[PDB]
Amino acid sequence: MDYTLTRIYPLQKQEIVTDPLEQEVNKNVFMGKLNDMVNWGRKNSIWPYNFGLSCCYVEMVTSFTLRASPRQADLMVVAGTCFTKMAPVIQRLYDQMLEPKWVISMGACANSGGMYDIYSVVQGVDKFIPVDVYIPGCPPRPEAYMQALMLLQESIGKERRPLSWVVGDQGVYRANMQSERERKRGERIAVTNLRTPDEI
Amino acid sequence: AQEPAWQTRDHLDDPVIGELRNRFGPDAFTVQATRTGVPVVWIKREQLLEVGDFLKKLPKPYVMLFDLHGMDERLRTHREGLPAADFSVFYHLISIDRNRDIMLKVALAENDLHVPTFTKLFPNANWYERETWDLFGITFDGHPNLRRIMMPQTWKGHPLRKDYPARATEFSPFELTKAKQDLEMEALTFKPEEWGMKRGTENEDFMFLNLGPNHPSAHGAFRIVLQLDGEEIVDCVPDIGYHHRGAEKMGERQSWHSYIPYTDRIEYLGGCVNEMPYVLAVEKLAGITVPDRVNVIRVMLSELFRINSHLLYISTFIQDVGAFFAFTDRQKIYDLVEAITGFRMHPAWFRIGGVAHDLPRGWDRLLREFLDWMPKRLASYEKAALQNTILKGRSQGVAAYGAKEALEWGTTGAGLRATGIDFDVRKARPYSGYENFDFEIPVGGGVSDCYTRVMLKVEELRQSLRILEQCLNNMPEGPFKADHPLTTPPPKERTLQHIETLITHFLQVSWGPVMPANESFQMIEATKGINSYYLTSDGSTMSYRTRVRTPSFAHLQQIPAAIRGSLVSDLIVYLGSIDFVMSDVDR
Amino acid sequence: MATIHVDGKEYEVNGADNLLEACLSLGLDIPYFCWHPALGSVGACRQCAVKQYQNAEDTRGRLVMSCMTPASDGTFISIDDEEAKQFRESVVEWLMTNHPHDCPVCEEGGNCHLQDMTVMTGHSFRRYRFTKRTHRNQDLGPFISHEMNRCIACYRCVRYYKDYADGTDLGVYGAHDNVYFGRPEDGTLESEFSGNLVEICPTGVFTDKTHSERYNRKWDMQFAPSICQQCSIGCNISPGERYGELRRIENRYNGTVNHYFLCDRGRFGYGYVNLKDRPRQPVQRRGDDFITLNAEQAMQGAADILRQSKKVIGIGSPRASVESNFALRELVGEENFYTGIAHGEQERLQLALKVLREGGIYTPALREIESYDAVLVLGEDVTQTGARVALAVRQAVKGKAREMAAAQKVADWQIAAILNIGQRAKHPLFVTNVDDTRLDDIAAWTYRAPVEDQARLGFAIAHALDNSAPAVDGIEPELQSKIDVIVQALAGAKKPLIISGTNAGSLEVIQAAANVAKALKGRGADVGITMIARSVNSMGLGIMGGGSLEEALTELETGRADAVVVLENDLHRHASAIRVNAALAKAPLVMVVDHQRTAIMENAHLVLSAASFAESDGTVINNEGRAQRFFQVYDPAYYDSKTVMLESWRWLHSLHSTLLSREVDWTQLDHVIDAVVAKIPELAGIKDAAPDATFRIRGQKLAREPHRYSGRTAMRANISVHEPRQPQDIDTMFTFSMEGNNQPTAHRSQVPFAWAPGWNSPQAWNKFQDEVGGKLRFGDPGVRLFETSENGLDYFTSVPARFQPQDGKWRIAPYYHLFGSDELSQRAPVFQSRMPQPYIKLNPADAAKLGVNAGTRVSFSYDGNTVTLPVEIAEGLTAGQVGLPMGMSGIAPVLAGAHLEDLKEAQ
Amino acid sequence: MYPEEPVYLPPRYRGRIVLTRDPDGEERCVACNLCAVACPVGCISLQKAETKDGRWYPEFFRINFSRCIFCGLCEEACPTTAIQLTPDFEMGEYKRQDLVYEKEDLLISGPGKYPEYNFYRMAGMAIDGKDKGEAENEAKPIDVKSLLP
Ligand code: SF4
Numbered sequence A: 001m002d003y004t005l006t007r008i009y010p011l012q013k014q015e016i017v018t019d020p021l022e023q024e025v026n027k028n029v030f031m032g033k034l035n036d037m038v039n040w041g042r043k044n045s046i047w048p049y050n051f052g053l054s055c056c057y058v059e060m061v062t063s064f065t066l067r068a069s070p071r072q073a074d075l076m077v078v079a080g081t082c083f084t085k086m087a088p089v090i091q092r093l094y095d096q097m098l099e100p101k102w103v104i105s106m107g108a109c110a111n112s113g114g115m116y117d118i119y120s121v122v123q124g125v126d127k128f129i130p131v132d133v134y135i136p137g138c139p140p141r142p143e144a145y146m147q148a149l150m151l152l153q154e155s156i157g158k159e160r161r162p163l164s165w166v167v168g169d170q171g172v173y174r175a176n177m178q179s180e181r182e183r184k185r186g187e188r189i190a191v192t193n194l195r196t197p198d199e200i
Numbered sequence B: 001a002q003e004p005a006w007q008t009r010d011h012l013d014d015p016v017i018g019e020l021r022n023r024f025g026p027d028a029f030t031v032q033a034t035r036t037g038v039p040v041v042w043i044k045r046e047q048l049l050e051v052g053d054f055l056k057k058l059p060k061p062y063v064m065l066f067d068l069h070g071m072d073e074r075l076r077t078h079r080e081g082l083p084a085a086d087f088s089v090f091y092h093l094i095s096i097d098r099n100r101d102i103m104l105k106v107a108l109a110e111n112d113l114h115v116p117t118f119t120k121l122f123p124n125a126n127w128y129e130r131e132t133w134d135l136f137g138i139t140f141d142g143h144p145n146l147r148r149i150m151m152p153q154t155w156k157g158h159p160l161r162k163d164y165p166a167r168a169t170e171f172s173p174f175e176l177t178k179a180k181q182d183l184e185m186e187a188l189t190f191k192p193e194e195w196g197m198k199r200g201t202e203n204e205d206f207m208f209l210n211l212g213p214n215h216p217s218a219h220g221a222f223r224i225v226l227q228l229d230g231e232e233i234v235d236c237v238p239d240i241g242y243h244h245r246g247a248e249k250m251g252e253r254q255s256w257h258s259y260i261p262y263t264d265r266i267e268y269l270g271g272c273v274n275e276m277p278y279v280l281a282v283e284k285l286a287g288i289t290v291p292d293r294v295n296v297i298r299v300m301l302s303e304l305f306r307i308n309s310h311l312l313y314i315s316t317f318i319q320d321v322g323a324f325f326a327f328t329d330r331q332k333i334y335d336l337v338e339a340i341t342g343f344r345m346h347p348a349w350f351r352i353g354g355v356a357h358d359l360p361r362g363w364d365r366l367l368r369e370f371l372d373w374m375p376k377r378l379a380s381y382e383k384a385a386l387q388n389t390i391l392k393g394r395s396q397g398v399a400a401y402g403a404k405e406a407l408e409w410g411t412t413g414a415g416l417r418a419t420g421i422d423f424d425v426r427k428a429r430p431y432s433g434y435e436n437f438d439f440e441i442p443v444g445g446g447v448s449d450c451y452t453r454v455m456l457k458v459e460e461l462r463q464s465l466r467i468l469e470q471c472l473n474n475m476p477e478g479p480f481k482a483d484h485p486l487t488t489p490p491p492k493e494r495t496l497q498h499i500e501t502l503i504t505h506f507l508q509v510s511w512g513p514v515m516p517a518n519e520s521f522q523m524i525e526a527t528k529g530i531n532s533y534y535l536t537s538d539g540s541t542m543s544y545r546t547r548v549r550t551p552s553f554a555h556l557q558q559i560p561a562a563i564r565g566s567l568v569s570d571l572i573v574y575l576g577s578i579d580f581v582m583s584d585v586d587r
Numbered sequence C: 001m002a003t004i005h006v007d008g009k010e011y012e013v014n015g016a017d018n019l020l021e022a023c024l025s026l027g028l029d030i031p032y033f034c035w036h037p038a039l040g041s042v043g044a045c046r047q048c049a050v051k052q053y054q055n056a057e058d059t060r061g062r063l064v065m066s067c068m069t070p071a072s073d074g075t076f077i078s079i080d081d082e083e084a085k086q087f088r089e090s091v092v093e094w095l096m097t098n099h100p101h102d103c104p105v106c107e108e109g110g111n112c113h114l115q116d117m118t119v120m121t122g123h124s125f126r127r128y129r130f131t132k133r134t135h136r137n138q139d140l141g142p143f144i145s146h147e148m149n150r151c152i153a154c155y156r157c158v159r160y161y162k163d164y165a166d167g168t169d170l171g172v173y174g175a176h177d178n179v180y181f182g183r184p185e186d187g188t189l190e191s192e193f194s195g196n197l198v199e200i201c202p203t204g205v206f207t208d209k210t211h212s213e214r215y216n217r218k219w220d221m222q223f224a225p226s227i228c229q230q231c232s233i234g235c236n237i238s239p240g241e242r243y244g245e246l247r248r249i250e251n252r253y254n255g256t257v258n259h260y261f262l263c264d265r266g267r268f269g270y271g272y273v274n275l276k277d278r279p280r281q282p283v284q285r286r287g288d289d290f291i292t293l294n295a296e297q298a299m300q301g302a303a304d305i306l307r308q309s310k311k312v313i314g315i316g317s318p319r320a321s322v323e324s325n326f327a328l329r330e331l332v333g334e335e336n337f338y339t340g341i342a343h344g345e346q347e348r349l350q351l352a353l354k355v356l357r358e359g360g361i362y363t364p365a366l367r368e369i370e371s372y373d374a375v376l377v378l379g380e381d382v383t384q385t386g387a388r389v390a391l392a393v394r395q396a397v398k399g400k401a402r403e404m405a406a407a408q409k410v411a412d413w414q415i416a417a418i419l420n421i422g423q424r425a426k427h428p429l430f431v432t433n434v435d436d437t438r439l440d441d442i443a444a445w446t447y448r449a450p451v452e453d454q455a456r457l458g459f460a461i462a463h464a465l466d467n468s469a470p471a472v473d474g475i476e477p478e479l480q481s482k483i484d485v486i487v488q489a490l491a492g493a494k495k496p497l498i499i500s501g502t503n504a505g506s507l508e509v510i511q512a513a514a515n516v517a518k519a520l521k522g523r524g525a526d527v528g529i530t531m532i533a534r535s536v537n538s539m540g541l542g543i544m545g546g547g548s549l550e551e552a553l554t555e556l557e558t559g560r561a562d563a564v565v566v567l568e569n570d571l572h573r574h575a576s577a578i579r580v581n582a583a584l585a586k587a588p589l590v591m592v593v594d595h596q597r598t599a600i601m602e603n604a605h606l607v608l609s610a611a612s613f614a615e616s617d618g619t620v621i622n623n624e625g626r627a628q629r630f631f632q633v634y635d636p637a638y639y640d641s642k643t644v645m646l647e648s649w650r651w652l653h654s655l656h657s658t659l660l661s662r663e664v665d666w667t668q669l670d671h672v673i674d675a676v677v678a679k680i681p682e683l684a685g686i687k688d689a690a691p692d693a694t695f696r697i698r699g700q701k702l703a704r705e706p707h708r709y710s711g712r713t714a715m716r717a718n719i720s721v722h723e724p725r726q727p728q729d730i731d732t733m734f735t736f737s738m739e740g741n742n743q744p745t746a747h748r749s750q751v752p753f754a755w756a757p758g759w760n761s762p763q764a765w766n767k768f769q770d771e772v773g774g775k776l777r778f779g780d781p782g783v784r785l786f787e788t789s790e791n792g793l794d795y796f797t798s799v800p801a802r803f804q805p806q807d808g809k810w811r812i813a814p815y816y817h818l819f820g821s822d823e824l825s826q827r828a829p830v831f832q833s834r835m836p837q838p839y840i841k842l843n844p845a846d847a848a849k850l851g852v853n854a855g856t857r858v859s860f861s862y863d864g865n866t867v868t869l870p871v872e873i874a875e876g877l878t879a880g881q882v883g884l885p886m887g888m889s890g891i892a893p894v895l896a897g898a899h900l901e902d903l904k905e906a907q
Numbered sequence D: 001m002y003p004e005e006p007v008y009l010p011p012r013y014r015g016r017i018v019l020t021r022d023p024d025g026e027e028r029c030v031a032c033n034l035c036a037v038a039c040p041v042g043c044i045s046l047q048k049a050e051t052k053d054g055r056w057y058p059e060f061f062r063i064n065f066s067r068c069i070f071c072g073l074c075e076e077a078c079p080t081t082a083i084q085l086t087p088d089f090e091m092g093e094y095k096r097q098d099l100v101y102e103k104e105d106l107l108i109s110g111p112g113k114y115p116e117y118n119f120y121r122m123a124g125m126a127i128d129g130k131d132k133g134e135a136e137n138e139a140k141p142i143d144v145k146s147l148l149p
């Protein structure tokens, strides 16, 4: 598994590296156990902050069926169009969160601007805010967010973040995971026949 | 009449034309023939206030300014019989007593884009004129505070102008940085006058009530600048434009068919209810009379979404104000819509001439099941409101207004009916074969308070269920797409096997359907009020102008006049009673 | 002229026109197929049906064909009559009965007149349930594809190919519903104007194979108004690009120049732009090491060497633009600027210019040529050098029939009648060449003789028309009889036309033509003079002036010059390869700015990646002296960001700045244009050739992409999911996007492409013209640099002596090929098949003397080099002369007039 | 519940877009670019290519699902029933670049929702297998040199 080191957004240190733990110089069975324990607690305790924008927030509340403060949130779900007047607000809320933090882009608009390539819309939240999981759709089905959360859990269980801010390497090593598209290419292509669009 | 509804008409027979001719003289105005369905009159800029007052002072007078916006006519080639103009401003006025409307149009020259303000005659014109200035650059002389309403105040250029690029510019971190700073320094650099507000007895606290993720109710995220005297509201200014996605500008970059997806995204909770007014207006431009089955299909889908929106609105109001699970009932509707459209929130199923596909086999079973589940569920919804003393106590007599306020602020829907004015487009101006359905319009008793508004929405659910039952038991058998040369796309089975239909499809899905030069207008009763589409074709495959009048924009401009003197708690209840979404307000 | 009443509304139209032409020019829409603004009216498809009433009281009129009905005064017609609409829809239905279901897989989809008319007639429902007729297709060569199933029998192809272009290999075969349109047998269409069939055919029977390989729909093409660069005629074209490759070249209507027709060399000879061996980034040669540099590094390093250079000379090219050549002139100095042309070629070009700029005789525009009543071509093989002029000469020769028909009061649009009245009657045409010409079919006489004898004929005709003209001695009585016929034909002509050029390789043939034209002018005749050059900006380089390539080489040879900046010139087509290569090897610095990989680049120290016409903006001057501006079609760095292909003027201007200030200056095109008009007063009209970059239509820039362009968020997704920023244009008034204006009523003259709602086919030009078949509504683009002078030139008294065969020496006669003679077009791959195989032509007698036959390979020495070529027998070629394919790689065009020595059977 | 309990999606559900094949196993796509122009977001890019027989096909087919709104306008625009929105909603990714699918991630091994439709059996353009006159409602070519009147 290769990792991307974000040592100390559009432009920042992104050096592809090897598992820092596997490196013998910094290889300790105890340290590895500690890393796994922290990753386990974080992936099984992702408190969310749903920034409600446009129509995607409505699908999100259906899935909900709260860390009202960005301070208590570990994940910011950008669900809606990134309007010009809203972009400063989104950046401020994300900048009022503490490490570790994650961002899931839900919807074509948050992903790339979607059908709204217009003068009053930022073409993607990834133009100003780092994103971890992208959910295609418009609006993405409530169940799609659940899949995205599970994908984030997997990515979080493989991260190598500093165990303490006073000792060790303060670098966030994120694993270069395999694309879901290539992972499930086989089953998708094998599909042959489908139900005719004639019945309910 | 034998003559088709889409036929271009000058409406000179309308009595108002004779009244204007006998008052201002025959050479004071030019009547334009259109497919809008309303007399269109071109008045001079120096008679706008004179004509307006006369219309306001007539037997059965014009009492409501439905819409006021601008139009850039510098690239319009087909302007035969229209006064010379580089820009124009249109005024849509409605006379409920005579059930008739008039469109007053004023020609402007590029060098002098100045028009007398209409705020004195109709108070709702304040926001419309600000939007016209923001997107066109037309100055309304006499306007109290003419500042941008949809774009940042620092925005350079007028977006809806033809010379203005439509696509997004390169993201600039610097602008975000500066924008973020300005936001952090807003409290320090606050001037009340900039928001139209004035400091009074002093010590009065100006405050910004952010209504986003702190108080999220699927209404969107906006802020209201509140001037308080303790907890009483002395004055408030709703800050909007935070959900503007340039939908009207997109109409000029999309074909008549490729724009349908965008219509559903003006009011997301309405779905097919948003594409009904657009398809009907494009069909008037095309001269298409849709078959009876399409009429009933388009009513059925619309009423399913009308129930969906009301359920969520009633559920949220009751949850916050009082103490009605929408999720379950809303899912059953989404399941039928998904089976028919293949999508839930944004069906984009309606087409120019019909619906994208035919009803899926088994639709009747699903509809019958839902029509056998809601009866009881609705009984629970009303019982609560009827016997929730907490709700009644916190809602009755809050943000109350009468008929005069509803008419002066363009309020439509439950708000207008609560004041006792019985004006529902489905009955007043029947469309989509609604005249073939037996239903009643819930009307209030003279006072539009938070409780009366919600109660009417509950009584509307019962009437919608009645229409859905008639749709299920009287679904006509026949075409789901009109037999017109401009139906888009043509029936697929024929496209797949016939060259003539293949050719028609190829061009209609590529360059686009060519709509002859004309102006159309269709107003419909949406889930939150009267929504309309003023479409202008210059004889091309894309719209020259797509004006979307949305009820939410007007309902948010009445807030200052209806909440002044009340407490912030009352404002939050009012905001809930107004069924509104910021997507409908900002478009 | 006449008052007509269409659907009640009254209109003023020309009574000399047909109702179709009149109503179309009024903006009224009537479906049609068989009628063409240039081919006249025939009345076949019966689609333009309109109801006609006898008076204003007639309520029961008759269905007539608008194309075959005069727009007479007091005409009452209705296009919206229900019966007319029903009949017009029925005509389309009948055409759809046997029409193939191949829209998705046909190359006319979205550009098909038949698709446009089906929709306009409102026919979307099929009632026919029987079988559809099928036809097997034919091979029509490497440019045109055949799909007869998609035919509608409008007869447009046969009427254009045979009655307009005078072709003989296309025809209509069969009868009833089994009518077939194609060649009598499978083979390559032989007409040099066969490509126009793709736009003439209203369906997809004839298509462009050069595009079919990388086919894209019209809505996905980025178009720009450009001028064709394959010869000196300067035809307006609409090059189109998709995914960073030139996909197709379409005709841009110029009612003053090419109107509706191009020639095969310009329509199918652009593949050189899509070659993958083209320079894309600046590269420096360090010994045997090649280093890719960036624009900034390239400028700094080059200026450093140039700053320490004793003398920097610059060699220009007739292929380069006026701005590009001027930039080199300013960088090296006018005294050190040399036109990359041979001394003789420059002399002939300057003589041709002097005739047009100081001869006192009007030079006609391409379309105006079709109105002369007598033509004399002296030494110019137009069909192979300026093909579009040959097409115009053909229409001029057909004037006799039009005149004869007008005498019988027959309408100008009734072509069938005009042709029957005419029969084989034609206006006098006389052509002179070293051998056979393609215009021999319509010529009254063809003089096949050495260039000297061809010139003597001109001096002779001049003396006969005016005794004051120098007389010629040695004319045999037989020739004198033939000369008299030409003299009487030119003397009897009311509007004579003399056509010459620099392709003959003789200064005397240009002087002879000048004398003949002066003689006719003296006799008070509307004489016209036309001179055919060789390249797109030959006349422009001629006006600018400069030393010859020979003089430039001598500077480098004496060593007086150390640095040579060559601009878009291979140098081997204008001078000996041995001399050029040696001279370029003695230069400390050799910089080459070209958009194509040439041989001289191999030993260049620095090679700047210049842009081609598709990726550049500039002004070129045609043979008539019209300065026309071409605009950039697409950004070369959009897909590949590493690409640094800049305009030659931008490269040279920046280098000059870095040389003087050590700072780079990539200026705007307008600034360079302003510099040219200020420094060179002769090239001052270039400023008015096109509006500047500040020009707007109601605030909007002109657009290059159609409004339905697709793939905006997916075309470059493979490179980066993040969509790139719209390429910006600071040089022209065109946007590299659809966010602009392409209205048919926009007050402009530069139209990137023709599209109007309901008209997606090339028939959409009708909505961009003042009158269908006329000129662009707001004027045709282009400015003539010079007007006819008040005074003329004195007669040239230098009559050459008759040609004499010399044992040993073999005069090289110039044979030109539309496919092969041009440099860039030969690089295009699709031209390899059409181009001729290498040959030498010999007089049958000379072949017998050398004891060689057809096919025999013969060895001969030119510049100290033995070359072997297969022998071809040319009876028309006079003895003592050998025929070589001028321009074909190896045979440089300069060889014309030179002599071969050791000509013997090889091996 | 999800993901343990799968979700019933109706047959017309507008989800992951796939390219389909004809009952003969050949790709149904002819690279006409109708789905792309009809697309309101411009998230489809393809290039026409031709087999030696003369069959049109997409040399490359790219769909940016980061911009896709799953509206079905492209599926409604095919004259060949090749592009189809299938009942699938799980397409979440880690990098946006991986939301750009190519033909390898789109071309399935079956006919999809439309079981038996071949445009090439309706077209008049000859291909390997179908010669002139072998399409539906198509007569056999009659030579102009035929002796029959
Ligand atoms: S992606 Fe679609 S559904 Fe989601 S917010 Fe944007 S427009 Fe609305």
Ligand code: SF4
Pocket (backbone or CB within 6 Å): B503, C099, C100, C101, C102, C103, C106, C107, C108, C109, C110, C112, C113, C114, C115, C150, C202, C203, C204, C205
């Ligand atoms: S010629 Fe035109 S109508 Fe016929 S198949 Fe081709 S595109 Fe379609």
Ligand code: SF4
Pocket (backbone or CB within 6 Å): C150, C151, C152, C153, C154, C155, C156, C157, C158, C181, C200, C201, C202, C203, C205, C206
């Ligand atoms: S091949 Fe083209 S031009 Fe010739 S008859 Fe057929 S459709 Fe007309």
Ligand code: SF4
Pocket (backbone or CB within 6 Å): C228, C229, C230, C231, C232, C233, C234, C235, C258, C262, C263, C264, C265, C266, C267, C385, C386, C387, C388, C389
């Ligand atoms: S005649 Fe010359 S300019 Fe015109 S198309 Fe042919 S090569 Fe190009």
Ligand code: SF4
Pocket (backbone or CB within 6 Å): C104, D028, D029, D030, D031, D032, D033, D034, D035, D036, D046, D077, D078, D079, D080, D081, D082, D083
């Ligand atoms: S998917 Fe269908 S519409 Fe798109 S290019 Fe292929 S055949 Fe044409």
Ligand code: SF4
Pocket (backbone or CB within 6 Å): D017, D038, D039, D040, D041, D042, D043, D044, D063, D067, D068, D069, D070, D071, D072, D073, D074, D075
């Ligand atoms: S589903 Fe809609 S947005 Fe997606 S590719 Fe098809 S047309 Fe474009």
Ligand code: FES
Pocket (backbone or CB within 6 Å): C020, C031, C032, C033, C034, C035, C042, C043, C044, C045, C046, C047, C048, C049, C065, C066, C067, C068
């Ligand atoms: S166009 Fe008039 S008969 Fe064909």
Ligand SMILES: [Ca+2]
Pocket (backbone or CB within 6 Å): C615, C616, C617, C632, C647, C731, C732
């Ligand atoms: Ca340029």
Ligand SMILES: [Cl-]
Pocket (backbone or CB within 6 Å): C453, C456, C474, C475, C476, C479, C802
């Ligand atoms: Cl002689």
